[PDB]
Amino acid sequence: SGAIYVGNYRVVNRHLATHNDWANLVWEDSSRDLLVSSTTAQGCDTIARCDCQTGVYYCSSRRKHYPVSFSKPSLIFVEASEYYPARYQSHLMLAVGHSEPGDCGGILRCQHGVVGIVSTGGNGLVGFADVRDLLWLDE
Ligand SMILES: COc1ccncc1CC(=O)N1CCC[C@@H](C(N)=O)C1
Numbered sequence: 427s428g429a430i431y432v433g434n435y436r437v438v439n440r441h442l443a444t445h446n447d448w449a450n451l452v453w454e455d456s457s458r459d460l461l462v463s464s465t466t467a468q469g470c471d472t473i474a475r476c477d478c479q480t481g482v483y484y485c486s487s488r489r490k491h492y493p494v495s496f497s498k499p500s501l502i503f504v505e506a507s508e509y510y511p512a513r514y515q516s517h518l519m520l521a522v523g524h525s526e527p528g529d530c531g532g533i534l535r536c537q538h539g540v541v542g543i544v545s546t547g548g549n550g551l552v553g554f555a556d557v558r559d560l561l562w563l564d565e
């Protein structure tokens with residue numbers, strides 16, 4: 427679990443979005459596993475605007491943060507779940523690192539701010555849904 431709170435928006439994994447998220451829907455993209463909903467309270471997370479390929483992510487299944495090198499956002503094949511059939515997930519960045527399904531939502535951050543959130547994993551890899559291209563989150 428986990429979310430990013432920026433201005434009047436909450437960014438979550440689309441597969442973990444709640445009824446309140448879908449009733450206050452701003453934007454969603456199944457191909458990215460992202461959903462953004464509106465909030466009443468103001469958020470203070472800073473979104474990174476950069477091409478960093480190194481950062482730190484939170485891993486809830488280890489109660490730890492790990493430093494990683496990650497790939498640039500791209501289309502990557504992802505196995506089926508109860509949420510999606512097998513498909514290419516877009517804007518996904520991969521790194522070598524531990525993850526489990528409940529780790530989705532953990533933040534990846536560089537020195538500039540929030541880069542994205544854990545969205546996939548398996549076989550010792552972890553994948554993060556990028557948010558740095560969503561320039562509208564700041565206005
Ligand atoms: C962090 O995720 C995991 C890690 C290890 N084994 C499995 C997982 C779970 C996983 O990959 N999922 C969860 C359901 C949505 C899927 C998607 N984005 O299409 C990804």
Ligand SMILES: [Zn+2]
Nearest residue numbers: 476478536538
């Ligand atoms: Zn950066």
